[PDB]
């Protein structure tokens, strides 16, 4: 079965599945957990950085696209770089040609279309990385989840990566609560950390191991690492 | 149009087409090179699957890249022509822009790079060739000897050999070449060279050509006799015991 | 022998093209969506499974507009659907640019047809993983169409595809018989909301979110618009009521 | 056959993984980062006594503030170094300054996944991934002394210490214990020489092993045999000392 | 995709051999035998026509001996059609050389070029090699009379006497037995006929199954002359040489 | 999209065979028999119009085609392959010869061109060899009358007489018996008709048979007068009637 | 080896399975059609089957208007039939532009045959699983019928039929011409030729037709058109008042 | 014929103090003998504490300032938010200008 | 323009080429060797446009050297000149043609005779007993037509040139700072270091 239909993305299985895409999705699960949640004033990205050795660094998982947009990654870093760089251009083309900030919803559409092209043609491979995009635009705070299959969904909160289901449950529970953490970023960030810890097990989030990003009403997307996040551990 | 990845990785971390390229070199006729204190010698053996040729016009094994550098090889003859032409051209180009002929390391690094490129480019197979490049840098007298292989790797040797039974002749050279006292003479260097070949040539007066390269574009190829005289003086070193 | 199903443009001994047939499986495995042609327009509707409470309601829109008078909804691999609309949008711009008049629905349908059919000619590409329902109002009436992964398409009175295509196709056949005089835009909107609630049983496990859009010469002026607020709620009710 | 950029059922790229296997077979290379600089050492590993060991170049200079060591199919690294140097020089031509070590690394990794037989995203014309890993080390005013490990996967990690090649797993564990935030350049030098000795099949001398470092003051320097030889002696001594 | 049907004509066998070249050679080995013998006053080219009939027009026929230049000619063993492609490019390289230097092209230069073309089909392109082996017979003012050979691999070498095609081992032994450095063109002609005569797979050795050519420098002139023998001429030389 | 089949579909087998060319010859073997006979003052090519239905109009399907006013072709094998070959042949006769020397190419050269096209479909990437064998007959001032045969490999050879397709073996044999170097054109046509009879199962008349000749110039088939050096085409297809008149003296 | 059945290269027997299988595809729609020639018109009859009740019967057709003068009916899957149609229309339009006169039926047929011959020889192109019947009243040849297949083959007919029960239609028509001794329906009005056509379509198939079971196309001097359900009914009635 | 250039007048001035620097310019913008605007800013804050002005043909001046600002944005993106030093900006701008060596930005730029 | 003269005597060819290199108002150099050795027995002098002059010469040089290495043989003077003509002829119909005129003097070791070839930037070649490019011919062609003989010795040749160079220094407006002379014969190419006062 599967073995005869997972050679490349251009092939459909007898049941209508695209295994190469499914396999790509698998790279995400094997990726370090990251969380995303928003109120009506802010959107937060809390990402657990993973280290190779104890002599290594905890690889960056948060990238800024524009002053009002950024995302967290789970999966193949190179693919996140490619996709983030593409987003940086679309966000940039919008400002230059139209003097308009790109709507978060529209950036999701672009990512979906770029990802899709890599699932219908021979020779290419799907992207192997999941992305959580947060932003503040002309319609408020926004959180998006990107899947290599090309599926992009807008949520109040979510998480991707290993054990990500912990955090996701916590959020689907804490919903009514954090959605109202307006005008108070530190409270949203804390909620973000309490969510990402629901997917811990190995260790405990440390200073050089924690990474957080915030954006909103009067807050240009900015990233905090180490010391700057000590007051959240 | 044709860009199939022919050279790729297999589970154990190998690139079989490069590995098989080497098997083609093992099959080529043995080649050797030893550097004296003021010269370098290149020796090649002559096959005999068919004999009734015309030695005048049949392509020789040692090729001049420029007046001060020569290149010998082991493996696919046709493949070696391609590398030689590219090196001869790169030699002129270097002279035309740097206003100075290539060093032997530069010319080697070039051939090597060309070989590496064919190991990770679509639509092409690696060169079934390994080379020994030798000569003297411009205005320098210190001898130079390098070797390249299908993978694109290269390095310099005091003495080296490639081709069939190169396994055997290398051993000879390892317990017959002293870095402390390299063949201080063109003559004793040419002898040490023929000796190592006789280990595998099996009586081959017409099956052993030797080329001697000295500083300042001084390159010359010995005649059957000149070499034949070396073999004779060597067969006596043995019998006289 | 076998293997006839591993390459896309290959004919099996029985004259079929298995990869296309497999793509269809992907279409049947998707959400259900429909199209109801009416006396002066067409109505589109689709099922939106609420995976979780985390999904922002009313946000992840699925129905798509092409030019200003055409509506498109599809079931199957969503990304493939967007890819097809993008093509259709270019296809439309091109036509208007040269001929000035916005593109006729029949002409637009062939554009998508030829393009989709194209992806069943080479083994270097994959067939589309969606069935698309689209249509609009033009110089001579309203038109409803459904395009299959094979590039096949026809004009319909009503159409459905996806998980509950049978429930829908059933409900649609009824309407066709009990309304030879033709449904109305206003009526088709409620009717649609119902066909969707019924066809949801073939997925009754997960909660959903309804989406409707319509293009009526009288209700929208021949332009495609989404049903929102009151008119939407009125339809959800009409459905939630007759579901009991 | 099967795509050169295909995913395994576990969500990994076959060619990249097989590439990593080729790297395991390479000569060991070790990097130690201290507040006094970064040390880079490698195992020459000549295949014959006739091979002139000093023509083994497995530690090269990118720019005055950046140097790097390789392990695996070393031939595959030539173009990577070339690209690296050009990036460094080019950055300087455009901005009249030194390129940040991380930026230089990110540039090198950008070539990494540019392989395939026609991957829809640009024009990645490289039949296979590189079969060599790199240890990039340097210094820059913003983040000081840095050590990076660049793989054929396109990803790169930052380390305080890192070992790649044949004895990497064992050597890494070694580095795990020995390393601390207050090491001195000399302590690092010795430490690198020590671990190389444990994993090297040959008896470490100044001919089958090479050291180097990069310091803000004098940039990247490759230690000449004589200098290292003494460091080896100094090591043998301090070890026999207990 | 396509990869599935790619023979990969240019790869190495585990033993470091080139499959296609090897099989092309195997193909050549079944071709009519061609022989080239170099004397002191000229060169002889002889070839046996494979497959003939009572109705085959031999007068207007040519399948093994072709004129490349006015000083160079070749004997063919293998696919005639493949050979013609190479011959035409060959004739062009010659004219180009002539137009560039205003001197006829040295024999080896032309041979190295064609051999290089062949070698190419061996290392890249994904195409099959040319199923052809050439025996080049030419003259130039730097090496006088020369005799060369090239095969699918792109390798070439020089000879005093040689053969290509069928029963080469048998023919080579016979040549290596009666050949002598001081031979004369007329001696060479006879040797050539004898060899073929003993390696034929046919009954007798008639003229209608032969092609003959000589490149001599007719004393009463001072220039080089190529002569492709006419049926009648081959019939004559056949009688004299005592084969009637 | 984009033809990604840039590799050869015809390759060498361990035995040294080229499968696709072999198979192509096999396809040719199944074809309807066709033949050609060279006389002293002409050449004749003929085949059987194997109507694939009585509702079909056999005239609308000519197996014998004119390439130049002094050259014609006929075949055995896959008709569609033949058709596109004839188009290319007629065009190459112009692009590569008439447009350069202002005169139609001589038979051997045109045949040579055709052979080339077929050889390419034997080695180019992404294609299969042509499934036909052609018999081309023509005349030219310096070479006179000639007859050739071109195979799927691209090989070609001159013949005094020959046959290809279904019953070639038997036909070739019958020709060897009747051929001589003193045959006049009518004699050859006659022998052609006799030979083709042994190959035709059903009806044998000017409506089931297609025959053409390369003989004298036909000033009547020129279409105009005034240019002395233009005397008309040597190629002439016989009429259903012209054939029957001869079948009576069979 | 066994791939000589996936792409268009020869099988050891010198066959092209993909072309053979494409022929199989032509019957997938289970529809039959036939064309006959009048005195100065050409008619094509084809079964029209509309299974789904949810379909708009007016958009289910396999007959096409290639040009003001050329008409084309297809036997095979609709997506491939439309691909062939679009192309034929483009080809016909261009021919007029470049040569100054209307592309003749037989010429467009040849052109399409050649295009099909190519998918037969090139590996990346699959053949189209359809059979195309072209009809018109050529200004030089008169009533004309030319049909092409996935093999790139094409020829002209006095009359012809295509589909699952093609053989019965053919032999039926054959018998009529063996009798009449002429190669066409000797009728002055196309209405009677359309009637002759439908009549025999019934004999050979042993089936009665309603106005919505058939699809009819007529070609006359300078124009090709298709009849309406009502135009067809008027036809069905006429035949009724004879049996 | 079409002339791709124009002159919008105006003047700019830059003076460097010991621990500060100033860049001034008038706000008038003209065409021939007409005033297009009495207040159309010509000196800009481009970030990283750098002020710029490309006086001359306003269309070219705007294109340059816009291209340089976008350059600052990407510098941050590609070099971990590093601050672009005034000297580095200057070198960057040289490349922007010389890029159009054969169809110049008709402006005199100061930073 | 610069002076470029060539004379073919009994057993050799002599090339005399001015040493001045003037740019606008100043004479930048007075020791310019306007020549390149294509092969041990073939020499080429050149004059023309500023950059094109040396770029072209060196380009031709690199090519003849590559031919020598590949074939281990030295092309005849006739072969080299034909190669050079063709290059210029291509150049004349290109975007920016090389504006260079050349004299090619070689000793054909196979014919054992000296040969002089004159070729202008358009690709116009001709073999002559003696030649010049630019305005040089205007003063010298008459002296040569007069005192030239096919059997002159290399010594008589140098005297004839000296006469030519003197006429040039007398009647020409520009100070070409004397010439550099070179001889090509069976033994190769050498430079007459003593012509500043021979």
Interface test with chain E among B16, B125, B129, by most E beta carbons within 10 Å: B125
DSSP character string of D83-152: HHHHHHHHHHHHHSSPPPHHHHHHHHHHHHT--BSS-BTB---BSS--SEEEEEEE--TTT-SEEEEE-T
DSSP character string of D24-65: HTSPPEEEEEETTEEEEEEE---SSTTB-GGG---EEEEETT
Nearest residue of E to residue G2, measured between CA atoms: E5
| Paired strand residues for E118 | none
Beta strands in B175-223 (DSSP E): 208-214, 218-221
Nearest residue of E to residue B16, measured between CA atoms: E14
Report the candidate in F159, F15, F3 with the shortest Cα–Cα distance to residue F74: F159
Distance CA(D143)–CA(D146), nearest Å, equals 7
Number of other residues whose CB lies within 10 A of the CB of residue E240: 12
Which residues lie below 8 Å from residue B129, measured CB to CB, with a gap of 6+? B21, B24, B25, B28, B73, B74, B75, B76, B79, B80, B83, B115, B150
Report the candidate in G17, G19, G34 with the shortest Cα–Cα distance to residue F53: G34
DSSP character string of E144-157: EEEEEEE-TTS-EE
Mode of pairing for the β-strands spanning F132-140 and G33-37: unpaired
Distance from CA of D49 to the nearest CA of E (A): 28
Orientation of helix A104-117 relative to helix C78-99, angle to 10°: 100
Residues in chain F whose beta carbon is closer than 8 A to a beta carbon of chain C? 1-2, 4
| Paired strand residues for C93 | none
Which residues lie below 8 Å from residue E52, measured CB to CB, with a gap of 6+? E58, E208, E209
The verdict on a CB contact (< 8 Å) between F12 and E131 is yes
Which residues lie below 8 Å from residue G99, measured CB to CB, with a gap of 6+? none
> Does I171 lie at the interface with B, CB-CB under 8 angstroms?
no
Rg (CA), chain C: 18
| Paired strand residues for C224 | C215
Report the candidate in F5, H84, C198 with the shortest Cα–Cα distance to residue G6: F5
- How big is the B-E interface in CB pairs under 8 Å? 96
Phi, psi of F176 (to 5 degrees): -50, -35
- How many CA atoms does the CB half-sphere of D6 hold within 13 Å? 21
Distance CA(A143)–CA(A104), nearest Å, equals 8
Report the candidate in G63, G58, G30 with the shortest Cα–Cα distance to residue G211: G58
- How big is the B-F interface in CB pairs under 8 Å? 6
Report the candidate in C142, C125, C241, C143 with the shortest Cα–Cα distance to residue C191: C241
G residues 124-153 lying closer than 8 A (beta carbon) to E: 124
The verdict on a CB contact (< 8 Å) between B11 and D24 is no
> For residue E79, what is the domain's CATH number?
3.60.20.10
Nearest residue of C to residue E4, measured between CA atoms: C7
Q: Which residues of E touch I75 (CB under 8 A)?
A: 101
| Paired strand residues for C154 | C146
How many domains, in total, are found in chain G?
1
The two tokens of residue E234 are: 């081959």
Using what technique was this structure determined? X-ray
Calculate the alpha carbon distances from D189 to A54, D34, D184 in Å: 20, 10, 9
All structural domains of chain F with their residue ranges: 1-250
How many domains, in total, are found in chain I?
1
Residue I86 is nearest to which of E100, E109, E142, comparing CB atoms?
Answer: E100
Which residue matches tokens 């058939």? G214
The verdict on a CB contact (< 8 Å) between D161 and A23 is no
Which strands, in side-by-side order, build the sheet including D59-63? D59-63, D66-72, D132-138, D146-150, D156-158
All structural domains of chain D with their residue ranges: 1-242
The two tokens of residue I116 are: 């002089």
Distance from CA of E53 to the nearest CA of G (A): 26
3-class SS of residue F71:
strand
Q: Which residues of E touch C6 (CB under 8 A)?
A: 4
Distance CA(B53)–CA(E157), nearest Å, equals 8
Report the candidate in H41, H55, H63, H60 with the shortest Cα–Cα distance to residue H110: H55
Phi, psi of B43 (to 5 degrees): -120, 140
> For residue G35, what is the domain's CATH number?
3.60.20.10
How is residue G151 annotated by DSSP?
A: T
Examine chains I and F and say if they touch (3+ CB pairs below 8 A): no
The verdict on a CB contact (< 8 Å) between B116 and D76 is yes
Which strands, in side-by-side order, build the sheet including E34-38? E161-164, E34-38, E42-48, E210-216, E225-228
- How big is the D-H interface in CB pairs under 8 Å? 27
3-class SS of residue I132:
strand
DSSP character string of F120-169: HTTTSBTB----EEEEEEEEETTTEEEEEEE-TTS-EEEBSEEEESTTHH
The two tokens of residue I13 are: 């060819």
> Does A88 lie at the interface with H, CB-CB under 8 angstroms?
yes
Question: CATH says B1-241 is which class?
Answer: alpha beta
The verdict on a CB contact (< 8 Å) between E126 and B4 is yes
Distance from CA of D46 to the nearest CA of E (A): 26
Nearest residue of B to residue D19, measured between CA atoms: B13
> Does G153 lie at the interface with F, CB-CB under 8 angstroms?
yes
Long-range contacts of D231-235 (CB under 8 A, 24+ apart): D231/D189, D231/D190, D231/D193, D232/D193, D232/D204, D232/D205, D232/D206, D234/D190, D235/D190, D235/D193, D235/D194, D235/D197
Distance CA(F84)–CA(H47), nearest Å, equals 68
Exposed (0-12), middle (13-18) or buried (19+): which is C217, by Cβ within 10 Å? middle
> For residue A132, what is the domain's CATH number?
3.60.20.10
CB E140 within 8 Å of CB E146:
yes
The two tokens of residue E10 are: 């240019």
3-class SS of residue E43:
strand
Distance from CA of F2 to the nearest CA of B (A): 10
Residue B58 is nearest to which of E13, E126, E157, comparing CB atoms?
Answer: E157
Distance CA(I11)–CA(I152), nearest Å, equals 9
CB B71 within 8 Å of CB B133:
yes
The verdict on a CB contact (< 8 Å) between A30 and D11 is yes
DSSP character string of H17-32: -SS-EEEEE---EEET
Rg (CA), chain H: 15
Number of other residues whose CB lies within 10 A of the CB of residue D202: 13
Q: Which residues of A touch H70 (CB under 8 A)?
A: 92, 96
Q: Which residues of A touch C19 (CB under 8 A)?
A: 11-12
Distance CA(A66)–CA(A63), nearest Å, equals 9
> Does C161 lie at the interface with G, CB-CB under 8 angstroms?
no
Calculate the alpha carbon distances from A162 to A35, A45, A166, D69 in Å: 11, 16, 9, 33
Distance CA(B225)–CA(B229), nearest Å, equals 6
Distance from CA of E142 to the nearest CA of F (A): 35
User: Interface partners of F (3+ CB pairs, < 8 Å)?
Assistant: B, C, E, G
| Paired strand residues for B74 | B130
The verdict on a CB contact (< 8 Å) between G14 and F29 is yes
Distance CA(E71)–CA(E141), nearest Å, equals 11
Which residue matches tokens 């210094």? D139
Sign of CA dihedral D120, D121, D126, D128: negative
DSSP character string of A74-120: EE-HHHHHHHHHHHHHHHHHHHHHHS-PPPHHHHHHHHHHHHHHTTT
Question: For chain D, how many residues are written?
Answer: 242
3-class SS of residue F73:
strand
Number of other residues whose CB lies within 10 A of the CB of residue I29: 12
Nearest residue of H to residue D142, measured between CA atoms: H82
Distance CA(E185)–CA(B89), nearest Å, equals 41
Distance CA(I62)–CA(C102), nearest Å, equals 65
CB E159 within 8 Å of CB B53:
yes
> For residue I143, what is the domain's CATH number?
3.60.20.10
Examine chains H and D and say if they touch (3+ CB pairs below 8 A): yes
CA angle C114, C115, C120 (to 5 degrees): 90
At the topology level, CATH places domain C1-244 in 3.60.20
Which helix (H) or strand (E) is B233 found in, with range? helix B224-239
Question: CATH says F1-250 is which class?
Answer: alpha beta
Distance from CA of F172 to the nearest CA of E (A): 9
Number of other residues whose CB lies within 10 A of the CB of residue D236: 13
Distance from CA of E45 to the nearest CA of D (A): 46
Torsion angle of alpha carbons G233, G235, G237, G240, nearest 10°?
Answer: -130
Beta strands in E151-235 (DSSP E): 156-158, 161-164, 210-216, 225-228
Phi, psi of C120 (to 5 degrees): -130, 20
Distance CA(C86)–CA(C65), nearest Å, equals 10
The verdict on a CB contact (< 8 Å) between F4 and C124 is yes
Report the candidate in F18, A123, F156, F155 with the shortest Cα–Cα distance to residue G9: F18
Which helix (H) or strand (E) is D187 found in, with range? helix D185-199
Range of the domain at A182: 1-233
Report the candidate in C62, C58, C39, C45 with the shortest Cα–Cα distance to residue C190: C45
The two tokens of residue B72 are: 């010998």
Which residue matches tokens 């499986």? C25
The verdict on a CB contact (< 8 Å) between B92 and I72 is no
CATH of D1-242, one of 3.40.50.720, 3.60.20.10, 3.30.450.20, 3.40.50.300: 3.60.20.10
Which strands, in side-by-side order, build the sheet including H44-45? H44-45, H51-56, H107-110
DSSP character string of G112-132: HHHHHHHHHHBSSSPPPS-EE
Exposed (0-12), middle (13-18) or buried (19+): which is D169, by Cβ within 10 Å? exposed
Q: Which residues of F touch C122 (CB under 8 A)?
A: 1
Distance from CA of C244 to the nearest CA of A (A): 30
Catalytic residues of C: 31
Interface test with chain C among A2, A14, A16, A165, by most C beta carbons within 10 Å: A16
How is residue C201 annotated by DSSP?
A: G
Residues in chain B whose beta carbon is closer than 8 A to a beta carbon of chain E? 2, 4, 6, 16-17, 20-27, 50, 52-54, 56-59, 76-79, 81-82, 118, 123-125, 127-128
How is residue B56 annotated by DSSP?
A: T
How many domains, in total, are found in chain E?
1
> Does C12 lie at the interface with G, CB-CB under 8 angstroms?
yes
Mode of pairing for the β-strands spanning F132-140 and A210-216: unpaired
All structural domains of chain C with their residue ranges: 1-244
């Amino acid at each position: 079965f599967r073995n005869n239909y997972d050679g490349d993305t251009v092939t459909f299985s007898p049941t209508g599945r695209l295994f190469q895409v499914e396999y790509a999705l698998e790279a995400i699960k094997q990726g370090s957990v990251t969380v995303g949640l928003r109120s009506n004033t802010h959107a937060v990205l809390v990402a657990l950085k993973r280290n190779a050795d104890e002599l290594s660094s905890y690889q960056k998982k948060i990238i800024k696209c524009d002053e009002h947009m950024g995302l967290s990654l789970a999966g193949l870093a190179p693919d996140a770089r490619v996709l983030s760089n593409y987003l940086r251009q679309q966000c940039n083309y919008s400002s230059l040609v139209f003097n308009r900030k790109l709507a978060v919803e529209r950036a999701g559409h672009l990512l979906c279309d770029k990802a899709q092209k890599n699932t219908q043609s021979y020779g290419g491979r799907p992207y192997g990385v999941g992305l959580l995009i947060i932003g503040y635009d002309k319609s408020g705070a926004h959180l998006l989840e990107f899947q290599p299959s090309g599926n992009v969904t807008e949520l109040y909160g979510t998480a991707i990566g290993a054990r990500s289901q912990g955090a996701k449950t916590y959020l689907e529970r804490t919903l009514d609560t954090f959605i109202k953490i307006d005008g108070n970023p530190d409270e949203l960030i804390k909620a973000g950390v309490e969510a990402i810890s629901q997917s811990l097990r190995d260790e405990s989030l440390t200073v050089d191991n924690l990474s957080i990003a915030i954006v909103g009403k009067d807050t240009p997307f900015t990233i905090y690492d180490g010391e700057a996040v000590a007051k959240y551990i | 149009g044709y860009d199939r990845a022919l050279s790729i990785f297999s589970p154990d971390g190998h690139i079989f087409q490069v590995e098989y390229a080497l098997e083609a070199v093992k099959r080529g006729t043995c080649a050797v090179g030893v550097k004296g204190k003021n010269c370098v010698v290149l020796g090649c053996e002559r096959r005999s699957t068919l004999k009734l040729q015309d030695t005048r016009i049949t392509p020789s094994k040692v090729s001049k890249i420029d007046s001060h550098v020569v290149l010998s090889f082991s493996g696919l003859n046709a493949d070696s022509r391609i590398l030689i032409e590219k090196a001869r051209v790169e030699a002129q180009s270097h002279r035309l822009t740097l206003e100075d002929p290539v060093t032997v390391e530069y010319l080697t690094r070039y051939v090597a790079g060309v070989q590496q490129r064919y190991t990770q480019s679509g639509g092409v197979r690696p060169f079934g060739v390994s080379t020994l490049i030798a000569g003297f840098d411009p205005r320098d007298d210190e001898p130079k000897l390098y070797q390249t292989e299908p993978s694109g790797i290269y390095s310099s040797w005091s003495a080296q050999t490639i081709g069939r039974n190169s396994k055997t002749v290398r051993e000879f050279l390892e317990k017959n070449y002293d870095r402390k006292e390299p063949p201080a003479t063109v003559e004793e260097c040419v002898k040490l060279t023929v000796r190592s070949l006789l280990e595998v040539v099996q009586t081959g007066a017409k099956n052993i050509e030797i080329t001697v390269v000295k500083p300042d574009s001084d390159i010359v190829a010995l005649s059957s006799e000149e070499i034949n005289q070396y073999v004779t003086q060597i067969e006596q070193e043995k019998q006289e015991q | 022998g076998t293997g006839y199903d591993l390459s896309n443009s290959v004919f099996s001994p029985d004259g079929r093209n298995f990869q296309v047939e497999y793509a269809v499986k992907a279409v049947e495995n998707g959400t259900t969506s429909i199209g109801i042609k009416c006396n002066d327009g067409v109505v589109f509707a689709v099922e939106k499974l609420i995976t979780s409470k985390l999904l922002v309601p009313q946000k992840n829109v699925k129905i798509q507009v092409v030019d200003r008078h055409i509506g498109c909804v599809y079931s199957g691999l969503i990304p493939d659907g967007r890819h097809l609309v993008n093509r259709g949008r270019e296809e439309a711009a091109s036509f208007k640019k040269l001929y000035k008049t916005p593109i006729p629905i029949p002409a637009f349908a062939d554009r998508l047809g030829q393009y989709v059919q194209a992806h069943t000619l080479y083994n270097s590409v994959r067939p589309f993983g969606v069935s698309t329902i689209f249509g609009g109002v033009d110089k001579n009436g309203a038109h409803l169409y459904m395009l299959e992964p094979s590039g096949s398409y026809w004009g319909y009175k009503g159409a459905a595809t996806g998980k509950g295509r049978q429930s829908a196709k059933a409900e649609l056949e009824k309407l066709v018989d009990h309304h030879p005089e033709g449904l109305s835009a206003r009526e088709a909107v409620k009717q649609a909301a119902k066909i969707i609630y019924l066809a949801h049983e073939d997925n009754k496990e997960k909660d959903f979110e309804l989406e409707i859009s319509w293009c009526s010469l009288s209700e929208t002026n021949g332009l495609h618009k989404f049903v929102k607020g009151d008119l939407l709620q009125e339809a959800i009710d009409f459905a939630q009521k007759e579901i009991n | 056959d099967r795509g050169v950029s295909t995913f395994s059922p576990e969500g990994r790229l076959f060619q990249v993984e097989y590439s990593l296997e080729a790297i395991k077979l390479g000569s060991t290379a070790i990097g130690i980062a201290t507040k006094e600089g970064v040390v880079l050492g490698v195992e020459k590993r000549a295949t014959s006594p006739l091979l002139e060991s000093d023509s083994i170049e497995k530690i090269v200079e990118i720019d005055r503030h950046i140097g790097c060591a390789m392990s695996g199919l070393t031939a595959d690294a030539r173009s990577m170094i070339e690209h690296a140097r050009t990036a460094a020089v080019t950055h300087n031509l455009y901005y009249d300054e030194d390129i940040n070590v991380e930026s230089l690394t990110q540039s090198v990794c950008d070539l990494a996944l540019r392989f395939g037989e026609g991957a829809s995203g640009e024009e990645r014309l490289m039949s296979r991934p590189f079969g060599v890993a790199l240890l990039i080390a340097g210094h820059d005013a913003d983040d000081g002394y840095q050590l990076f490990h660049a793989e054929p996967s396109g990803t790169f990690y930052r380390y305080n210490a890192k070992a790649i090649g044949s004895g990497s797993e064992g050597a890494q564990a070694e580095l795990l214990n020995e390393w601390h935030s207050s090491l001195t350049l000399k302590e690092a030098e010795l430490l690198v020489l020590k671990i190389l000795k444990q994993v090297m099949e040959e008896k470490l001398d100044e001919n089958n092993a090479q050291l180097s470092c990069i310091t803000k003051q004098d940039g990247f320097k490759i230690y000449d045999n004589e200098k290292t030889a003494e460091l080896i002696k100094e090591l043998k001594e301090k070890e026999a000392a207990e | 995709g396509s990869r599935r049907y790619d023979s990969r004509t240019t790869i190495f066998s585990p033993e470091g051999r080139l499959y296609q070249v090897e099989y092309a050679l195997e193909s050549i080995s079944h071709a009519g035998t061609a022989i080239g013998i170099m004397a002191s006053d000229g060169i002889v080219l002889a070839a046996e026509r494979k497959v003939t009939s009572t109705l085959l027009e031999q007068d207007t026929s040519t399948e093994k001996l072709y004129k490349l230049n006015d000083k160079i000619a070749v004997a063919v063993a293998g696919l005639t059609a493949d050979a013609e492609i190479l011959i035409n490019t060959a004739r062009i390289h010659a004219q180009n050389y002539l137009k560039t230097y205003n001197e006829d092209i040295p024999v080896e230069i032309l041979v190295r070029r064609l051999s290089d073309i062949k070698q190419g089909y061996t290392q890249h392109g994904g195409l099959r090699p040319f199923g052809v082996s050439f025996i080049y017979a030419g003259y130039d003012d730097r090496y006088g009379y020369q005799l060369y050979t090239s095969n699918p691999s792109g390798n070439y070498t020089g000879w005093k006497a040689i053969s290509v095609g069928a029963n080469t081992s048998a023919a080579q032994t016979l040549l290596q037995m009666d050949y002598k450095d001081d031979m004369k063109v007329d001696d060479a002609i006879e040797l050539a006929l004898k060899t073929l005569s003993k390696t034929t797979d046919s009954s007798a050795l008639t003229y209608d199954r032969l092609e003959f050519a000589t490149i001599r420098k007719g004393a009463n002139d001072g220039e080089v002359y190529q002569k492709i023998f006419k049926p009648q001429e081959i019939k004559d030389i056949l009688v004299k040489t005592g084969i009637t | 999209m984009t033809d990604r089949y840039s590799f050869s579909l015809t390759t060498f087998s361990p035995s040294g065979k080229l499968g696709q060319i072999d198979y192509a010859l096999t396809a040719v073997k199944q074809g309807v028999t066709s033949l050609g006979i060279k006389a002293t003052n002409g050449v004749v090519i003929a085949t059987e119009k194997k109507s694939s239905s009585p509702l079909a109009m056999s005239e609308t399907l000519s197996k014998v085609s004119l390439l130049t006013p002094d050259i014609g072709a006929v075949y055995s094998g896959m008709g569609p392959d033949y058709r596109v070959l004839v188009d290319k042949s007629r065009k190459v006769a112009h692009t590569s010869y008439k447009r350069i020397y202002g005169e139609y190419p001589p038979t051997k050269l045109l045949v040579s061109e055709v052979a080339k096209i077929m050889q390419e479909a034997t080695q180019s990437g992404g294609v299969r060899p042509f499934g036909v064998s052609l018999l081309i007959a023509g005349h030219d001032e310096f070479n006179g009358f000639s007859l050739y045969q071109v195979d799927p490999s691209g090989s070609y050879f001159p013949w005094k007489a020959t046959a290809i397709g279904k019953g070639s073996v038997a036909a070739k044999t019958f020709l060897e018996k009747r051929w001589n170097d003193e045959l006049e054109l009518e004699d050859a046509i006659h022998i052609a008709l006799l030979t083709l009879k042994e190959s035709v199962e059903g009806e044998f008349n000017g409506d089931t048979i297609e025959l053409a000749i390369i003989g004298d110039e036909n000033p009547d088939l020129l279409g105009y007068t005034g240019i002395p050096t233009d005397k008309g085409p040597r190629f002439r297809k016989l009429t259903s009637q012209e054939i029957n008149d001869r079948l009576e003296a069979l | 080896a066994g791939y000589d059945r996936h792409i268009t290269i020869f099988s050891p027997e010198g066959r092209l399975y993909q072309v053979e299988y494409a022929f199989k595809a032509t019957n997938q729609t289970n529809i039959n059609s036939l064309a006959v020639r009048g005195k100065d018109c050409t008619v094509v009859i084809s079964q029209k089957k509309v299974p789904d009740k949810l379909l708009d019967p007016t958009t289910v057709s396999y007959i096409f208007c290639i040009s003001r003068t050329i008409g084309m009916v297809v036997n095979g899957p609709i997506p491939d039939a439309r691909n062939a149609a679009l192309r034929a229309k483009a080809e016909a339009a261009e021919f007029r532009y470049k040569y100054g006169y209307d592309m003749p039926c037989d010429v467009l047929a040849k052109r399409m045959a050649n295009l099909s011959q190519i998918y037969t020889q090139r590996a990346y192109m699959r053949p189209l699983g359809v059979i195309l019947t072209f009809v018109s009243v050529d200004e030089e040849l008169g009533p004309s019928i030319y049909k092409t297949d996935p093999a790139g083959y094409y020829v002209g007919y006095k009359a012809t039929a295509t589909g699952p029960k093609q053989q019965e239609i053919t032999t039926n028509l054959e018998n009529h011409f063996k009798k009449s001794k002429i190669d066409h329906i000797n009728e002055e009005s196309w209405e009677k030729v359309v009637e002759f056509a439908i009549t025999h379509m019934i004999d050979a198939l042993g089936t009665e037709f309603s106005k919505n079971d058939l699809e009819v196309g007529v070609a006359t001097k300078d124009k090709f058109f298709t009849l309406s359900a009502e135009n067809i009914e008027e036809r069905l009635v006429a035949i009724a008042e004879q049996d | 014929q079409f002339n791709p250039y124009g002159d919008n007048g105006g003047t700019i001035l830059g003076i460097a103090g010991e621990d500060f620097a100033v860049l001034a310019g008038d706000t008038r913008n003209i065409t021939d003998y007409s005033i297009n605007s009495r207040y159309e800013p010509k000196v800009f804050d481009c970030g990283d504490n750098i002020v710029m002005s490309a006086n001359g043909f306003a269309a070219d001046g705007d294109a340059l300032v816009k291209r340089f600002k976008n350059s600052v944005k990407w510098y941050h993106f590609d070099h971990n938010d590093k601050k672009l030093s005034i000297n580095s900006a200057a070198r960057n701008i040289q490349h922007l200008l010389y890029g159009k060596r054969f169809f110049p930005y008709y402006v005199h730029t100061i930073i | 323009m610069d002076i470029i003269l060539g004379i073919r005597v009994q057993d050799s060819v002599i090339l005399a080429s001015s040493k001045a290199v003037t740019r606008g108002i100043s004479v930048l150099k007075d020791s310019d060797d306007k020549t390149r050795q294509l092969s041990p027995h073939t020499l080429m002098s050149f004059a023309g446009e500023a950059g094109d002059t040396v770029q072209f010469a060196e380009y031709i040089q690199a090519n003849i050297q590559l031919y020598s290495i590949r074939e281990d043989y030295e092309l005849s003077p006739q072969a080299v000149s034909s190669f050079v003509r063709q290059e210029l002829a291509k150049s004349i119909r290109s975007r920016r043609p090389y504006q260079v005129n050349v004299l090619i003097g070689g000793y054909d070791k196979k014919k054992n005779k000296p040969e002089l070839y004159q070729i202008d930037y358009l690709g116009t070649k001709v073999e002559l007993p003696y030649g010049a490019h630019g305005y040089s011919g205007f003063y010298t062609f008459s002296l040569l037509d007069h005192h030239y003989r096919p059997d002159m010795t290399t010594e008589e040749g140098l005297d004839l040139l000296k006469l030519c160079v003197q006429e040039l220094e007398k009647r020409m407006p520009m100070d070409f700072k004397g010439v550099i002379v070179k001889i090509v014969d069976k033994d190769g190419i050498r430079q007459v270091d003593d012509f500043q006062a021979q």
